Nucleic acid binder design. Structure first.
Ligand SMILES: [Mg+2]
Lengths: 87, 14, 95, 98, 107, 95, 107, 82, 98
DNA sequence: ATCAATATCCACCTGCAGATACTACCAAAAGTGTATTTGGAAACTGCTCCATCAAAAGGCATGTTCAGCTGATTCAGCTGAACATGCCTTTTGATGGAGCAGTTTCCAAATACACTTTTGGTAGTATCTGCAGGTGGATATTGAT
DNA sequence: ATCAATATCCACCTGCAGATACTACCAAAAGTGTATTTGGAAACTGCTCCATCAAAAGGCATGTTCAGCTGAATCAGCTGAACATGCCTTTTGATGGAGCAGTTTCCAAATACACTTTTGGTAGTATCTGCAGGTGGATATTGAT
């Protein structure tokens, strides 16, 4: 077959500018240079926790596809209830 | 052969 | 093409009752649908628990009413209790 | 050549991003990050495109929320520059950590 | 002479559907006649409250069609809806304009 | 003068397996009851949701296990899952 | 002739009671044979884990009777139990001795 | 010599609570601010508890009324039932 | 004539009260305050003994938690004295208001 | 340093509050035997997710430059910590009755069934229209001077 | 308070994307209107345990003296904002390939249900003892000198 291209270091796709923009929506005016690596850390931990629960739902359903409902159920569990994607 | 804790102790035997 | 149901039709009715010249995007409607299903669960859940706490096997309008008082804040509870008390009393005395 | 003083474009950006709702992280980088993290928990996973967009919507809302709490932490310390110790205190008080 | 329980009760929101979802959701053994009517009425009240305020946010921003931003403005600018939905993310809502005073320039 | 059930008898057996020389206060035992009831509701709860999410009438060992994975941290899950797989094994092999 | 589902499964915890509490609890229409065995095992394990560490704590304070203080010390001194019970108040437990370093005197 | 029930929550008591919480020094304004927070806590919990009581058509607030109220307010308490 | 310096008895109280689990408010003033606040929801109300104890336990645990978070907010502003703005910031980031 | 005041620590003691242990009674678990419901196994869809690629805006990286923020330093004044007393409030321990809860009784209410009727979904089609995205041009804001 | 660079505003002006609105249309669900079940409000009453109320006891209100903390003022170093410049990667919008969700039909396990047999777990009770006080005397800590 083709097998998938190796995924490494994707957390660095969360660029300094993208983190500036998020901070601006959050009302931040000045940003220490250490903030970018601290945000990447926090984001990885958030995504790992949501995805681990999404994928648990996927596995319990005996599917190989993670659905929007899987994610929504994971978010609800985590007390980050999301509107706009079902349920 | 009962309950095994994280510490590595067991619940006796039978 | 399995019939996947929603509260859209009703949400849109109520939109036209309050803002008759106003539309809603399908995203916004997606949000309203989540909103209804969420409040539904929260109320039903409080009610389910309320009944178990009182060794009852029936969820009546009484259990819904107390659930609304626990889940909604002050004014939204007052008005929600009105519209509910009204809807029932009317449903009952329309037979 | 005429410069805005430090702070003036920052405030311009706050006004601009607070007015809008568009996701602020590039779609494709974020999708790779999701596929990488998922893949390390389970190989051979696929994703509904909506599943990823839901994750992106949930992550940006969380980070924006966290930057608001972080900024309050910086301002409590009489600064206007957020630093790690602000993020750390926000998360400790949110009970997202011990 | 087939009347829907909605019409009996004077509701847009579907009392049948709500009776059934209370049935299939295993909240209790049995469900009273009143319960679905009350609950459909509360859900209808709350969706009317949100559509009133989002309708107003639509008109204020010189728009005819309510989008998620209008719902976020409505909900976040209302002390009580904001509390009801204080652990809820509205996809494509954004946030309220809000800059901390100390961040604004000059003396 | 009616029966007020608890988990006390079981908590006390498990205590004697784990700390044979050790006792437990009335207040402590009250805390262990609250504990068991809590983790009961949390696990049954998530199981219920899991079953409802997959359009199923039945909560099996599998719904309990998934629940336990979702609810227990790191090493607690791993050990709970094996104690639970084990007890089900030992019970399925009992004429 | 009769042999408790517990005694078959290898458990102190009551498999029978857990099955009935799953019925009278409106979790689902039906309840698999194993579900209450598993659940009873998980509750026994977690009870062992907490009585283990509480026992240790009780011994350390030169004591042979577990009290709430001993429960609170075991739980709040275990990364994993502390997370599982992060939103829980153990009555009469107090807190862990913790003085922020900067609050210690200079010499 | 009569005073408000809230001031029954005295400076030295509030000092003791702070001390369990590892506080060394306390501004004098804290004592009224603490009373403020206390009141709101008890308001929110007792409201829900009493709502349980009224639902059970009782005239007595039970431990369970309180434990059930604490649980939904996100302050689960162990040791009083449930 | 021997006098302990400011903050030496404070540390000693900290070590003493962190070691104990006794309730730190006097029962009767607390019981009165419950019954008052309650009165404003339903009159002629009776309270089980345990019911009032459950409240005091909960309420003291809450306030002690709050003093810990408050203390971290004071120490974050490079102080050792808790103030209203500390309690207020803790409550804000915990999501109790604002 | 020394010197003393007070706090803290460990051994030993001992009364009884609060454990552990014991018994008979019955609610609720287990056993057996039919009575229903389900949740894979197989076998097909179409849906939709992966992938790959081409062309082009659009945002990212990096280096330079300096405004102004952070945090170290110093210091004055005010604000909380400490402390010595007695009085006022709480704590303790001893009675009347509100009301919780025990329980049985019968009907108004909810279930179960199987009809008939209507709603709400969708596919398909067209049919309309709100608004995003663009473009000037008139107007406001900021920062030099 | 003048001026110019550049950001921002707002009213026009499009072309769809996405909304609205027909169908016709049907399939599943909601409703109808008896046949059957039963849960819970009703009424009664007993016996907890809750409210009240009067002696026992230490905790708290108080005002004074000042240690040291907070916050104000100042200043220099250097971090982070702005922005110009170069160009890599994401965005967009196709096409083809297939993996896999999602349905729909046999059922042989599996679990529910109705009834009977058995005993584990509860509530009185009836003892047993862990340990919270209390005392004595050694040592450590703190702060004066
Ligand atoms: Mg990898």
């Amino acid at each position: 077959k083709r097998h998938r291209k190796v995924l490494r270091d994707n957390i660095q796709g969360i660029t300094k500018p993208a983190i500036r923009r998020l901070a601006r929506r959050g009302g931040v005016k000045r940003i220490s240079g250490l903030i970018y690596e601290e945000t990447r850390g926090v984001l990885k931990v958030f995504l790992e926790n949501v995805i681990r629960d999404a994928v648990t739902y996927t596995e319990h359903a005996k599917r190989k596809t993670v659905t929007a409902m899987d994610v929504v159920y994971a978010l609800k569990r985590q007390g980050r209830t999301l509107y706009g994607f079902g349920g | 052969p009962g309950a095994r804790l994280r510490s590595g102790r067991s619940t006796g035997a039978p | 093409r399995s019939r996947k149901e929603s509260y859209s039709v009703y949400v849109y009715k109520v939109l036209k009752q309050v803002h008759p010249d106003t539309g809603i995007s399908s995203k916004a409607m997606g949000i309203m649908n989540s909103f209804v299903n969420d409040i539904f669960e929260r109320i039903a859940g409080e009610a389910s628990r309320l009944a178990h706490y009182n060794k009852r096997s029936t969820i009546t309008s009484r259990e819904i009413q107390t659930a609304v008082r626990l889940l909604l804040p002050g004014e939204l509870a007052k008005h929600a209790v009105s519209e509910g008390t009204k809807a029932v009393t009317k449903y009952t005395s329309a037979k | 050549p005429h410069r805005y003083r430090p702070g003036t474009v920052a405030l311009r950006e706050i006004r601009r991003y607070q007015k809008s709702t568009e996701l602020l992280i590039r779609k494709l980088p974020f999708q790779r990050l999701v596929r990488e993290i998922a893949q390390d928990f389970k190989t051979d996973l696929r994703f509904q495109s909506s599943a990823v967009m839901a994750l992106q919507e949930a992550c940006e809302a969380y980070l924006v929320g966290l930057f608001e709490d972080t900024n309050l932490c910086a301002i409590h310390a009489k600064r206007v520059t957020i630093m790690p110790k602000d993020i750390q205190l926000a998360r400790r008080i949110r009970g997202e950590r011990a | 002479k087939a009347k829907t329980r909605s019409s009996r009760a004077g509701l847009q929101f579907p009392v049948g559907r709500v009776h059934r979802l209370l049935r299939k959701g295993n909240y209790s053994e049995r469900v009273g006649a009143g319960a679905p009517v009350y609950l459909a009425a509360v859900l209808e009240y709350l969706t009317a409250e949100i559509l009133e305020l989002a309708g107003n946010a639509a008109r204020d921003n010189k728009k005819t069609r309510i989008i998620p931003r209008h719902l976020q403005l409505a909900i976040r600018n209302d002390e009580e809806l904001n509390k009801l939905l204080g652990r809820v993310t509205i996809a494509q809502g954004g946030v309220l304009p809000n800059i901390q005073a100390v961040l604004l320039p000059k003396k």
